[PDB]
Amino acid sequence: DSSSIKVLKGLDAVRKRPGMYIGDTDDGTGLHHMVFEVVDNAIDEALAGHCKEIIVTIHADNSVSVQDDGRGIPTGIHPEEGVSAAEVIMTVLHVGVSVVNALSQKLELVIQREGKIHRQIYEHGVPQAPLAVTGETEKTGTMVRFWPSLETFTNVTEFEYEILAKRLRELSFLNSGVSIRLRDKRDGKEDHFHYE
Numbered sequence: 001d002s003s004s005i006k007v008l009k010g011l012d013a014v015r016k017r018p019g020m021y022i023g024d025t026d027d028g029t030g031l032h033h034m035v036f037e038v039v040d041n042a043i044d045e046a047l048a049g050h051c052k053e054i055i056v057t058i059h060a061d062n063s064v065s066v067q068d069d070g071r072g073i074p075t076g077i078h079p080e081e082g083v084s085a086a087e088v089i090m091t092v093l094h095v096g097v098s099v100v101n102a103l104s105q106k107l108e109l110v111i112q113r114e115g116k117i118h119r120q121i122y123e124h125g126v127p128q129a130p131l132a133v134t135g136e137t138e139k140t141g142t143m144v145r146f147w148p149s150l151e152t153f154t155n156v157t158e159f160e161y162e163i164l165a166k167r168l169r170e171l172s173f174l175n176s177g178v179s180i181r182l183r184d185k186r187d188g189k190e191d192h193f194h195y196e
């Protein structure tokens with residue numbers, strides 16, 4: 001199946017030359033760019049008028065989650081490639097959320113839409129299983145939590161609050177109307193960014 005082959009070549013490509021996709025993997029810039037890429041996806045959903053709140057969280061285990069209250073990534077199985085439209089978005093190259101997926105040792109996807117909660121787990125960009133319904137809900141949105149591969153990233157491996165805060169504040173400025181929360185579980189620090 002062409003599609004599976006393609007996807008794995010893409011993932012492999014990104015892990016072999018991460019500099020070409022995420023930036024420097026020693027100085028922290030690439031590592032923080034992982035967060036910004038995921039956030040940019042949530043910003044699109046806000047720009048489209050479906051997302052009002054985005055929540056960025058620094059977890060104690062040095063992963064980062066991004067939650068929006070948008071529509072939820074479509075979950076219906078694409079006829080054309082045999083898996084959830086969400087998995088296509090998470091894995092197909094073109095920088096795209098697939099790059100962050102490729103360079104994460106684990107990624108967790110939680111989608112709320114059409115009354116159902118769906119969940120999928122990825123490792124180094126590869127799904128452990130197809131997207132599956134775990135429950136019901138009245139809410140909508142997309143939550144992506146990722147744990148960056150320490151095979152890829154060295155030296156600066158811990159997320160730095162201030163670096164995330166500066167960029168998220170910039171993004172709220174550029175995208176007037178979007179409301180962004182940043183919360184650090186390591187010490188309870190939090191901020192709310194919202195402009196005009």
Ligand SMILES: CNc1cccc2cc(C(=O)Nc3ccc(C(=O)O)cc3)c(=O)[nH]c12
Nearest residue numbers: 041042045066067068070071072073142144
């Ligand atoms: C944390 N959030 C987050 C992380 C990473 C990727 C995405 C991707 C989307 C997205 O693709 N939404 C979307 C919604 C509806 C439809 C439709 O046709 O109904 C098509 C696309 C998103 O909303 N949020 C994301």
